[PDB]
């Protein structure tokens, strides 16, 4: 009876979602004029990676950026001057994520070794040493983001997302309920809530304080590789392997807009937003990044010049630059 | 134009560039090998023979050639999502045990281990990320296989095998069955070796297969192949 009850409750939630929706967003966004062609030229060409780059995180000052590669190096860069600020040797070469702290003191990394390493940058010795090694994940870490200098939220391949007390070294809040590994996560600007998408084609809103699942969205055909918040904190565009990008509203509890185009059949690796949030920039497997518009739902620009597949994409805090991560071991900054 | 601190920062960046180029030159010579198979196949035994959570990395040097072996058996997560990381690998070491055919799988006891190993080899061999990567196949527990094949026939697990009860015939037939699973035989070699209590022969076989892969890579670089 309970198993049939779950299907009936899901049907009731579907009926409530259909009942709430009255007007399509594409009909409402017809009024605003199109942005037009948006041309961005590369400003800097960054080198020093001899291996496949998987992740990059922007600094809050908009000048510093970290990069994760398979040569065993986390390299912290100076975007303006093209200098290498730090070069962090890694114990485990297989790394899939890297985070930069909001204060700028710490740098995280994680991958197939199931260990999250926190690196101190403002030490008096002058060498970037390991401060804390987080352990206890049965699956490969796929994403990590600093809430604070003492708190960090990590996603793993054991279907468990945890909140880590860096000073204590143990986990405070455990999040469960994702069928399948959680590919990524993003932090809201208020930092009170985060949403993580997994490989069961679902993205679940989470509450750091409460520790329980707030909302769940099931608008994706296959699986979620990427997820990024909107600047206000009420919406989040999502990237998937079915060559689609979807926008979900927390308050409306339904799918706002769908981004797709017939010739592109490749999956989406990463998504990001500009300062205003008008431009949706995504990363694809067809070696070319495409810029989308939040309201108009068209293509505003095309980024090319990456020889190998685009691993990651991040727009800086003030919105002055965009650096794209590719597998050809070059990070290119687009203004 | 540049200030004194900007000049010293550029000099620091050039010293970091020298260290990164030196570490990349060291990493380019080193051979990476991927270890695959079931948990009870005998990965730990063959790793200990070659030496004498997360990813287990083994470093050993044979005939002035550096080897990296990555054991991925500890992870419980879905393999399809992290399999693309291992694209640039020299060879795949796939280890199974010959005595697995009578021992039924622990999980629900509804499928023979040998056929699960066939599906395990089929998913790795036909993977889109591994098209030109050769597979070094190891068949473990051959002495137990000889005893088991003397006591119990191979016909009971599947009726398709109609050959006479012989150790050499059954071993060669299982080898042929693993070879048949390859769907791209021209661009992918399968190196099959029966493992034994002699430590030297396994490391030698691995060096011969890696040497043939480096010959293939050098010929592709020259453009003759």
């Amino acid at each position, epitope marked *: 009876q309970l198993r049939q009850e779950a299907e009936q409750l899901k049907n009731q939630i579907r009926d409530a979602r259909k009942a709430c929706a009255d007007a399509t967003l594409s009909q409402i966004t017809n009024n605003i004029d199109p942005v037009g062609r948006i041309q961005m030229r590369t400003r800097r060409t960054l080198r020093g990676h001899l291996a496949k780059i998987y992740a990059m995180h922007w600094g809050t000052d908009s000048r510093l950026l970290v990069s994760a590669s398979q040569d065993g190096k986390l390299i912290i860069w*100076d975007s303006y001057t093209t200098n290498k600020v730090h070069a962090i040797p890694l114990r485990s070469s297989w790394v899939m994520t890297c985070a930069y702290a909001p204060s700028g003191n710490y740098v995280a990394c994680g991958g197939l070794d199931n260990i999250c390493s926190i690196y101190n940058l*403002k030490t008096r010795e002058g060498n970037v040493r390991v401060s804390r090694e987080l352990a206890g994940h049965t699956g490969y870490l796929s994403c990590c983001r600093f809430l604070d200098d003492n708190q960090i939220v990590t996603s793993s391949g054991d279907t468990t997302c945890a909140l880590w007390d860096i000073e204590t070294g143990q986990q405070t809040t455990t999040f469960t309920g994702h069928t399948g590994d959680v590919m990524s996560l993003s932090l809201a600007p208020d930092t009170r809530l985060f949403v993580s998408g997994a490989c069961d084609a679902s993205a679940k809103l989470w509450d750091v304080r409460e520790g329980m699942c707030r909302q769940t969205f099931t608008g994706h055909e296959s699986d979620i590789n990427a997820i990024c918040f909107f600047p206000n904190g009420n919406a989040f565009a999502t990237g998937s392997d079915d060559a689609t990008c979807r926008l979900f509203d927390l308050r409306a509890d339904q799918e706002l807009m769908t981004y797709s185009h017939d010739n592109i059949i490749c999956g989406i690796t990463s998504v990001s937003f500009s300062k205003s949030g008008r431009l949706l920039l995504a990363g694809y497997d067809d070696f070319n990044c495409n810029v989308w518009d939040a309201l108009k739902a068209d293509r505003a620009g095309v980024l090319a010049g990456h020889d190998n597949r685009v691993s990651c994409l991040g727009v800086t805090d003030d919105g002055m630059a965009v650096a794209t991560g590719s597998w050809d071991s070059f990070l290119k900054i687009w203004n | 134009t540049l*200030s*004194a601190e900007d000049k010293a*920062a550029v000099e620091r960046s050039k*010293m970091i560039d020298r260290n990164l180029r030196e570490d990349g030159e060291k990493a380019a010579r080193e051979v990476k090998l991927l270890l695959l198979g079931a948990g009870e196949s005998g990965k730990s035994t063959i790793v200990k023979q070659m030496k004498i959570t997360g990813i287990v990395e083994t470093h050993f040097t044979f005939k002035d050639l550096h080897f990296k072996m990555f054991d991925v058996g500890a992870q419980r997560s879905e393999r399809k999502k992290w399999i693309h990381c291992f694209e640039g690998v020299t060879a795949i070491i796939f280890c199974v045990a010959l005595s697995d055919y009578d021992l039924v799988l622990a999980e629900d006891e509804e499928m023979n281990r040998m056929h699960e190993s066939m599906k395990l080899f089929d998913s790795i061999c036909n993977n889109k990320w591994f098209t030109d990567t050769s597979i070094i196949l190891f068949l473990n527990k051959k002495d137990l296989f000889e005893e088991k094949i003397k006591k119990s026939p191979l016909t009971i697990c599947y009726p398709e095998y109609a050959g006479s009860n012989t150790y050499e015939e059954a071993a060669a037939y299982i080898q042929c069955q693993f070879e048949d699973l390859n769907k791209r035989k021209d661009t992918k070699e399968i190196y099959t070796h029966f493992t034994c209590s002699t430590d030297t022969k396994n490391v030698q076989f691995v060096f011969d297969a890696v040497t043939d892969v480096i010959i293939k890579n050098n010929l592709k670089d020259c453009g003759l192949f």
Partner: single-chain antibody
Amino acid sequence: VQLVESGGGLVQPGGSRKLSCSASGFAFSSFGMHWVRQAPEKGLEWVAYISSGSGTIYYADTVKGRFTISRDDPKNTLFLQMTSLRSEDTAMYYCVRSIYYYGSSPFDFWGQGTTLTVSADIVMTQATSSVPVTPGESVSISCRSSKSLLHSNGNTYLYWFLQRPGQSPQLLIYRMSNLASGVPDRFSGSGSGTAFTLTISRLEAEDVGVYYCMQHLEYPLTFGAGTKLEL
């Protein structure tokens, strides 16, 4: 982190002496090293610099040629070679570690100083020489330069030091926008090109000392005269 100097004592004029400074508790190979000299009844003065990896070497114009600087990274020892010493070299020599990147704090750690007694250009201008102050009131210290230190990248290369009597000097404020690590919020730097101001709110007895303004726009490094406070 510790730097100690050895090789002092009395030296005859025209002779030679080789100093050695040993480093402990930090990666010696990554820091550039400064020599700073101090006369007994005058302010500090810069001597020489060697970069990390010995890539570039700078000297002051008054000490060019006679002094030779080297460093050995596997033994973590800084060597100063002195040839044909004169009567003006009667000073205490300090070792300074300075890392250079965006956001770094160079001149943060100072040595202890070895005494050497011998027996026979941007000009930084301290307008005042001594100001009697009381603990509790705000104290204003002014420094001036001969050249505008405002570089086109936005950084103003003025560093503020405090040398407590009988102790090694410490960094207070670097680049005029940033406080040094370990310095309280009592110190604050303000001003613009050619006119700088230092303010000390909630004066303390430990704050009492000699204050130096240092430019770092171009070599050779030239220091200030040194504003001393008293009670």
